Amino acid sequence: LAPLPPHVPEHLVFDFDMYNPSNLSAGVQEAWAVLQESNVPDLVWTRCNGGHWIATRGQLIREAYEDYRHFSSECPFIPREAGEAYDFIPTSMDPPEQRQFRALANQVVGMPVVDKLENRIQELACSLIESLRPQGQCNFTEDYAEPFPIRIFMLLAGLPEEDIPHLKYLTDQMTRPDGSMTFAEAKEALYDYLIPIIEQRRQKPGTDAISIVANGQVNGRPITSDEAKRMCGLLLVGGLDTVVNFLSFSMEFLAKSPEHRQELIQRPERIPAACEELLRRFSLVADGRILTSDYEFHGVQLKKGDQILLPQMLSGLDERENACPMHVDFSRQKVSHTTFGHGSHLCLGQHLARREIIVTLKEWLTRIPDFSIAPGAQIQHKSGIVSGVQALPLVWDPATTKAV
Ligand code: HEM
Ligand SMILES: CC1(C)[C@@H]2CC[C@@]1(C)C(=O)C2
Ligand SMILES: [K+]
Numbered sequence: 001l002a003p004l005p006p007h008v009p010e011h012l013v014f015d016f017d018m019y020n021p022s023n024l025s026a027g028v029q030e031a032w033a034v035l036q037e038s039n040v041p042d043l044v045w046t047r048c049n050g051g052h053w054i055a056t057r058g059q060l061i062r063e064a065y066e067d068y069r070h071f072s073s074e075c076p077f078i079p080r081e082a083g084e085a086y087d088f089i090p091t092s093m094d095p096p097e098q099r100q101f102r103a104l105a106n107q108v109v110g111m112p113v114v115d116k117l118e119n120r121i122q123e124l125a126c127s128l129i130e131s132l133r134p135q136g137q138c139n140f141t142e143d144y145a146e147p148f149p150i151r152i153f154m155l156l157a158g159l160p161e162e163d164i165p166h167l168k169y170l171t172d173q174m175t176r177p178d179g180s181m182t183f184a185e186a187k188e189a190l191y192d193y194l195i196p197i198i199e200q201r202r203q204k205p206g207t208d209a210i211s212i213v214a215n216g217q218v219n220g221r222p223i224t225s226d227e228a229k230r231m232c233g234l235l236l237v238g239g240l241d242t243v244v245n246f247l248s249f250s251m252e253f254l255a256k257s258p259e260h261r262q263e264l265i266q267r268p269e270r271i272p273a274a275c276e277e278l279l280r281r282f283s284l285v286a287d288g289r290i291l292t293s294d295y296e297f298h299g300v301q302l303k304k305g306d307q308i309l310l311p312q313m314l315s316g317l318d319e320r321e322n323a324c325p326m327h328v329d330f331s332r333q334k335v336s337h338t339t340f341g342h343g344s345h346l347c348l349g350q351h352l353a354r355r356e357i358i359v360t361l362k363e364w365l366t367r368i369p370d371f372s373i374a375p376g377a378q379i380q381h382k383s384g385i386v387s388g389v390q391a392l393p394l395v396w397d398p399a400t401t402k403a404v
């Protein structure tokens with residue numbers, strides 16, 4: 001616990017630990033949702049992880065993401081030493097500077113690229129699920145959730161699959177550190193990996209995502225090698241952690257809810273709507289901003305340099321945004337969330353993520369329509385910048401499946 005700063009009033013101190021929150025055994029989303037009980041203010045300070053503000057309601061989260069002149073992305077991670085070392089592009093830049101790098105990043109993960117990968121995405125999903133289907137069981141996080149999105153990303157980036165354990169280890173240290181590595185060490189290891197590859201693909205340009213970034217232009221002038229490395233590293237982290245973790249929350253839910261499986265089996269055209277409602281309920285990202293100056297925000301004096309967590313996860317769990325927010329309703333009329341962020345840093349990979357989610361749901365429910373959590377298993381979650389599921393043992397009767 002870190003000393004309460006002079007300017008923070010005692011009545012706003014809620015000691016939430018974003019990397020190990022108290023109620024984690026109830027589920028990670030439920031654990032973060034304690035910040036939205038009736039007694040907790042819209043905006044609290046925690047003395048954990050070096051001390052920082054935490055906006056607890058959607059209205060505040062949205063407002064702060066919109067207002068980049070006060071809430072800068074120059075230092076977006078907690079703790080402060082991670083935020084300070086964080087220099088990925090475009091996330092560590094504010095508009096106007098940030099904008100030129102988004103266009104280039106859209107070339108490698110945008111909707112036209114998803115469209116092109118659509119065949120290989122469908123093929124991999126079907127191939128992984130068919131391999132599992134006759135077994136009547138799997139360790140879902142390791143047997144599908146990791147390989148499906150990771151192999152697609154490695155394909156797109158033109159990187160060998162033998163590199164996956166190394167890269168996955170590093171990305172995990174940046175979002176859910178286990179203590180062995182600081183954020184800055186993990187980041188420099190990722191850069192060290194990328195540097196020779198970026199140099200090779202600048203000499204010998206190809207079709208892969210690293211070539212496209214490394215040989216690209218930003219508003220009409222050549223990207224530097226340094227800029228290319230800082231963008232490629234961001235893309236790697238996005239590719240190796242987000243969808244991986246979200247698939248496991250979604251499948252855990254479906255494994256526990258037969259009526260929700262039945263709804264999608266009966267009406268598969270609802271799968272896109274169900275993806276969105278699962279993105280609200282099992283939102284999993286929480287990063288933030290740093291104050292560029294002293295600023296009074298919703299009755300609370302913030303000091304220049306203060307860090308504020310603006311949990312993208314919380315907005316759609318907010319009762320004030322969505323009635324009965326812990327209930328999953330595929331017919332929910334207005335699904336309101338900030339799962340893919342908000343403002344000028346809106347997720348660039350969201351079209352790829354939705355596609356992978358939708359393809360997974362359709363292809364899993366076609367072949368393995370009925371499945372359950374393995375008898376006796378208690379599923380454990382983990383919290384951090386991106387929250388996750390430690391393991392997800394599933395079982396089914398093969399007699400109920402169908403090869404397609
Ligand atoms: C379930 C899947 C995903 C979720 C929930 C998610 C969430 C987010 C969020 C909340 C942000 C904004 C962060 C901020 O404002 O500081 C973001 C940005 C970003 N994401 Fe995603 N993401 C997902 C998948 C992906 C994938 C697969 C990629 C592929 C590389 C990706 C690439 C990016 C990039 C490049 C940005 C930065 C945009 C900018 O700073 O201008 N994301 N993501
Ligand atoms: C918070 C994010 C999900 C977003 C894309 C990858 C991630 C970990 C970042 O550093 C920016
Ligand atoms: K920084």
Ligand SMILES: [Xe]
Binds near residue numbers: 109235
């Ligand atoms: Xe990518």
Ligand SMILES: [Xe]
Binds near residue numbers: 157209213232235236
């Ligand atoms: Xe990349």
Ligand SMILES: [Xe]
Binds near residue numbers: 250
């Ligand atoms: Xe899923």
Ligand SMILES: [Xe]
Binds near residue numbers: 264265268361362366
């Ligand atoms: Xe389905």
